[PDB]
Amino acid sequence: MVVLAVLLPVVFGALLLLGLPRALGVLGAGLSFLLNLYLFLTHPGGVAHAFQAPLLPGAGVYWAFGLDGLSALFFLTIALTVFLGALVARVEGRFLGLALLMEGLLLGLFAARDLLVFYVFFEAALIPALLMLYLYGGEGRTRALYTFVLFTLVGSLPMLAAVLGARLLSGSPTFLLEDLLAHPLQEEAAFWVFLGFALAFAIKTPLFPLHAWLPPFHQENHPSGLADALGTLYKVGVFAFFRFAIPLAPEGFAQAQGLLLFLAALSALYGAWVAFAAKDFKTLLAYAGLSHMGVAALGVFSGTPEGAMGGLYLLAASGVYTGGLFLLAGRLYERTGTLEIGRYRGLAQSAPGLAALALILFLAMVGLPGLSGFPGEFLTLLGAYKASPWLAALAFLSVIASAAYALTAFQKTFWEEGGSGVKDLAGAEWGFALLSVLALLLMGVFPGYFARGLHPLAEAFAKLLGG
Amino acid sequence: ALFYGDRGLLSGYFGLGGAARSLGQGLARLQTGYLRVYALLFVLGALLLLGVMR
Amino acid sequence: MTLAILAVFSVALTLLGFVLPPQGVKRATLLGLALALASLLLTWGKPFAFGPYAVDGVSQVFTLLALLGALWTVGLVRSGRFEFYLLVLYAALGMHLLASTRHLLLMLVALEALSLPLYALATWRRGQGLEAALKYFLLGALAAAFFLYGAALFYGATGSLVLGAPGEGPLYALALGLLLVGLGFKAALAPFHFWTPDVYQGSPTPVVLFMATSVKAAAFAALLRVAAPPEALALLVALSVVVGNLAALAQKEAKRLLAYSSIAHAGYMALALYTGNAQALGFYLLTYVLATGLAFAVLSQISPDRVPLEALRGLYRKDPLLGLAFLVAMLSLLGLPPLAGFWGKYLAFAEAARAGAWGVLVLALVTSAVSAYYYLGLGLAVFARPEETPFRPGPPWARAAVVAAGVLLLALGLLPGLVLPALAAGG
Amino acid sequence: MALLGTILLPLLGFALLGLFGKRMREPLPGVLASGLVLASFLLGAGLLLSGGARFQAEWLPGIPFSLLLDNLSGFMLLIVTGVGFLIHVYAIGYMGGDPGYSRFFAYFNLFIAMMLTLVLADSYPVMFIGWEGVGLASFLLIGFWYKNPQYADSARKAFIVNRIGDLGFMLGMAILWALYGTLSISELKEAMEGPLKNPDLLALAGLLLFLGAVGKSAQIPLMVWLPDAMAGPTPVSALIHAATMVTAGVYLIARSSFLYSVLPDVSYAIAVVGLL
């Protein structure tokens, strides 16, 4: 059931860290992909594989797991992305076990059916990231690590008091989200809990004034960008907003909606804009991920089940193609040795199909229709314009700067005058490119098939902001 | 210019960390090592606590 | 009737040391403490009271922890003075009597019985060890005077010197404050914390192990008996956590930084005092005791007199298991999932919020997030390049002990629903 | 469904010429592309002569996938297919000794299929899909011989300006969803006549739609991006300036005639900009 699909990446990461060899982690990630896709099918609903076990009976804590429609496609997204990053990795630092550990942890986190288990995984996922960051590259590694870790922890630890309040002040018997949703928090008490949620989720969303951890984090990781891929998968903030923050304390969110939408719009614009000034790949992609989280936060904060489903779909797909671009940059680094955007211009003539792969990933990035980003982007526009037309309009002076930075980097990196000539493609990169573009096309062309399970949650939790 | 501004924002977060450490060492300099200092601060804190208890 | 075991072993060995070599006295002390621990196990759920001596969950849990720390630190001590063993036994009995009674004056007698050997055990003869011993002795006698006038005013409020009396208004509050002064002093609570860094820094490392396990355990075991009001509790917690973490940032030495960390953790533990749970607090202190004893056994394998922060580094290359255990211990002392430090922290925070004290709790959490600075400057340092540092990589005794302690920390972090169900009467 | 194959063909063709591409002899890409263009012309003339076509497939909730082939759509289809096949043969001739033959004709197939998806549309999202797909193929083909920095910034500026117009389009589409909730030109038109509401908002949606049309057909102020399309190969420049990527703007007004005919100031301004 759900437990096995969640645990498999963790145990395979253990068998990669403590056991040997490197190759078996790739097939472990593949097995995770297969099982998560199977569980994605035949899915009746939330109860799909319900699991209940005691953790702190006296305190009210249970291992609570199951597949939502949201959890299903997020399982699929993570399993696919991590399997791609496992085969093509070339990190080989003997730490891919940490990446599989983080995969399983994020799977359990999305499978969290009770609040405390969500919080537990939210806090536990700090370990892999810091490890694969610290001992696998970077000059200011420890300092950017302290920045990121202190940001997350200062945000998270008061959210523990927030969740204790959400359990106690409502008289909930346990931490189960079902029970906590059955006992809503009252006025002048949901205020503080939602504020604690909004700081901790925004600093990890990330939003504009609190985004300062993302570029230093993404630069100093393993230059292959596996740690960067999984850290980009670590922006799960938006989800916790829609599923946990807003429903559990909508009363304060009613007042804070204007400020949240403002932060989301300004983050999107600022990221997609400053990405132009970025002289390197890690900074550029960090600002891109900030832009995408700004758009997703806009879609969620706007109400408008349209915008909510669009923001979530955009979040999943953006994680996918950003991790793809990180792995692509890591492979071009491994074969060249430098990530500068100016130098090594002729790549396109030497690289036959790596240019087209990078182009497809970039097009999905700037939200070109026919790829997975456009459904969520446009649905978020619609929902935000319903919520606040000004903020959706300003926020969508983004496709311009998006196109600018993406095409500038692609041209100055690949298209221009030939250099020495660089390695063309690796055997693992073959399956990597094939599956990546396959998934992009399938999820962009048929957002009807996917995201159907996202609609009921979105409409119910958006009408919850109504009468 | 906004890249410069983000640089300055991260520098300001660093300034927050530096203010925390500076406050920390100002509180650490409170432990001089003379026993008379320690007993005086002990008695002061105990009086303060007994005053709060009302 | 484990106290009988302790008294018998101590008094017999006192004379037998004249006929027995220090090694034989060491093995006898080990046997006696292990038998007292076993007797505690077989008596789980068998309350036994004679007079003011009253065995409850607190008694059993905290005396088990103290005996654990005593056994561990005896494992390390090999000095050719049987006295350096006898005191351990003595301290054990004393701390036992501290947790197992409600009589205020018997509490004072137990405080003296446990505190006297601890002054002397820190005498490796290094002048700073003597400086620490003198600071410790004078401040402890001051705290004993304060505690005693508190017990006197308590008797002024009621006809008995046993806790559980109804209690009056302002005079009862004053008496309780004058008791809490000395008890928190023993528990490293601010603004009474000044002795802790100097004493932890001056004393030999295994002695600081013994301290940082048994002293804190027994002090909180005595604290739970007091009905401390929440306002004074807020003052102590706020001051302790804030000053502790802040001044710990600026520290350059491992032992002094760790003493500040123990101040911050005592501030955290004092949150259960809002509810007096004594189950959650038993679990918390179990985890903290295990981790800190582990860390200080390793520090003893590094240096008895003093350990700098750089010395901790490179340990994994030196010793793999030791580096792993130090990293795990640092994370658990940070209270991170899925480690038992997180369960203890969560249980204390739940008791505190359930009492409805919000600003204090949030401040403790923000400052605990601040603590990652040095908690990480220690935990991760295991992997750094070894700089010049004396290193004696221990016997298999301490290695296996460290392994068991770390495994138990992480196991109780993952699956607390194993023992925590039995920290009350013990079904 | 047969209507969809007309677009599916210059997708299989593009995939062959892009993925493998240079594994073929020199004349072949033109042969395959011209065959797909001609076999789309034929099956479109056959459908139009048969009265018309309709196709609906499941898509985003509330936003289905609607293809409608009528007189106005088939007119553009026949135009584009005929001129495209003629330029295909002229490119078979004109492209000689130049590598990227397959690149050229794969981009051609993509361009034709996307322009067909654009004009054959009953829903504005599909029109916008075609819009940005045409912008992509144009940016690609202008920089066909990529070794030149001069003929890279041209296409760069082209696609930036294109995306500005497309943002205007997106905002108009969001407006025409907030108001009615249909966003399908057929039902949106059948529901838009009668009780017009918020005439300011209707004129605004028309203003943003016209702004998109200006970027597409390179009107003021977005005028500057078209001349640099000289950088691309000559048959590409013909296809971009004559048959496609410019007719989209006027076709937008032709399909939104129901909207612009009740907007006197908007249509007057459109005439003014055309004159300018």
From Swiss-Prot, chain A:
Location(s) in or outside the cell: Cell inner membrane
Main location: membrane
Pfam families on file: Proton_antipo_M
InterPro entries attached to this UniProt entry: NADH_Q_OxRdtase_chainM/4 (IPR010227), NADH_UbQ_OxRdtase (IPR003918), ND/Mrp_TM (IPR001750)
EC number from the UniProt entry: 7.1.1.-
Keywords: Cell inner membrane, Cell membrane, Membrane, NAD, Quinone, Translocase, Transmembrane, Transmembrane helix
Highest taxon in the source lineage: Bacteria
Example GO biological process: ATP synthesis coupled electron transport
Transmembrane segments: 1-21, 23-43, 47-67, 69-89, 91-111, 115-135, 144-164, 190-210, 258-278, 284-304, 308-328, 354-374, 390-410, 430-450
Catalytic activity: a quinone + NADH + 5 H(+)(in) = a quinol + NAD(+) + 4 H(+)(out)
Molecular function in Gene Ontology: NADH dehydrogenase (ubiquinone) activity; ubiquinone binding
A cellular component annotation (GO) from this entry: plasma membrane
Classification via PANTHER family: NADH-UBIQUINONE OXIDOREDUCTASE CHAIN 4
Subunit comment: NDH-1 is composed of 15 different subunits, Nqo1 to Nqo15. The complex has a L-shaped structure, with the hydrophobic arm (subunits Nqo7, Nqo8 and Nqo10 to Nqo14) embedded in the membrane and the hydrophilic peripheral arm (subunits Nqo1 to Nqo6, Nqo9 and Nqo15) protruding into the bacterial cytoplasm. The hydrophilic domain contains all the redox centers.
Entry-linked NCBIfam families: NDH_I_M (TIGR01972)
Family listed: Belongs to the complex I subunit 4 family.
Name this protein carries in UniProt: NADH-quinone oxidoreductase subunit 13
Organism this protein belongs to: Thermus thermophilus (strain ATCC 27634 / DSM 579 / HB8)
Gene designation per UniProt: nqo13
From Swiss-Prot, chain B:
Subcellular location: Cell inner membrane
Highest taxon in the source lineage: Bacteria
Transmembrane spans: 33-53
Subunit organization: NDH-1 is composed of 15 different subunits, Nqo1 to Nqo15. The complex has a L-shaped structure, with the hydrophobic arm (subunits Nqo7, Nqo8 and Nqo10 to Nqo14) embedded in the membrane and the hydrophilic peripheral arm (subunits Nqo1 to Nqo6, Nqo9 and Nqo15) protruding into the bacterial cytoplasm. The hydrophilic domain contains all the redox centers.
Family label: Belongs to the complex I subunit 5 family.
Protein task: NDH-1 shuttles electrons from NADH, via FMN and iron-sulfur (Fe-S) centers, to quinones in the respiratory chain. The immediate electron acceptor for the enzyme in this species is menaquinone. Couples the redox reaction to proton translocation (for every two electrons transferred, four hydrogen ions are translocated across the cytoplasmic membrane), and thus conserves the redox energy in a proton gradient required for the synthesis of ATP.
Full protein name: NADH-quinone oxidoreductase subunit 12
Organism expressing this protein natively: Thermus thermophilus (strain ATCC 27634 / DSM 579 / HB8)
Gene: nqo12
First-to-last residue of the parent protein present: 552 to 605 of 606
From Swiss-Prot, chain C:
EC number(s) stated in the UniProt entry for this protein: 7.1.1.-
Pfam families: Proton_antipo_M (PF00361)
Reaction catalysed by this enzyme: a quinone + NADH + 5 H(+)(in) = a quinol + NAD(+) + 4 H(+)(out)
Domain of life (superkingdom): Bacteria
Keyword list, A-Z: Cell inner membrane, Cell membrane, Membrane, NAD, Quinone, Translocase, Transmembrane, Transmembrane helix, Transport
Membrane spanning residue stretches: 1-21, 30-50, 57-77, 79-99, 104-124, 137-157, 172-192, 204-224, 230-250, 257-277, 280-300, 322-342, 360-380, 400-420
InterPro entries xref list: NADH-Q_OxRdtase_suN/2 (IPR010096), ND/Mrp_TM (IPR001750)
Subcellular location: Cell inner membrane
Function description: NDH-1 shuttles electrons from NADH, via FMN and iron-sulfur (Fe-S) centers, to quinones in the respiratory chain. The immediate electron acceptor for the enzyme in this species is menaquinone. Couples the redox reaction to proton translocation (for every two electrons transferred, four hydrogen ions are translocated across the cytoplasmic membrane), and thus conserves the redox energy in a proton gradient required for the synthesis of ATP.
Family per record: Belongs to the complex I subunit 2 family.
Protein name as it appears in the record: NADH-quinone oxidoreductase subunit 14
Organism: Thermus thermophilus (strain ATCC 27634 / DSM 579 / HB8)
